[PDB]
Design a protein around this nucleic acid. Structure first.
Length: 76
RNA sequence: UUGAUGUCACGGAACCUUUGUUGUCUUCGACAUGGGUA
């Protein structure tokens, strides 16, 4: 395998989801499903708010697939 | 700290209603103080 280092630079304030317990991270929780397009909060330990933000590779993948659809539309 | 053949969340105006307002002559006279003498 070969590794491609990337970085993302924001030009505007970005949105982030409210952290939720693992019993609630499923399709029947409206709050979790609505936040799936935002950034996430990670707690270092589940009983403390201490943590830091992150972005999933899945979301970037989805955005890239949409972009690829548009580019291939332009090139026929 | 994701999981992958499927994410329109740039898919959603913190928006809407509310009088810093009501009442009042820039006037006017008797009052302070605590003993003293048998």
């Amino acid at each position: 395998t070969t590794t491609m280092k990337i970085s993302i630079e924001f030009l505007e304030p970005f949105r982030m989801t409210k952290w939720q317990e693992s019993t609630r991270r499923n399709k029947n929780n409206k709050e979790f499903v609505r936040g799936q397009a935002f950034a996430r909060w990670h707690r270092n330990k589940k009983d403390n708010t201490k943590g830091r933000p992150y972005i999933t590779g899945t979301l970037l993948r989805s955005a890239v697939i949409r972009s690829a659809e548009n580019l291939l539309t332009l090139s026929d």
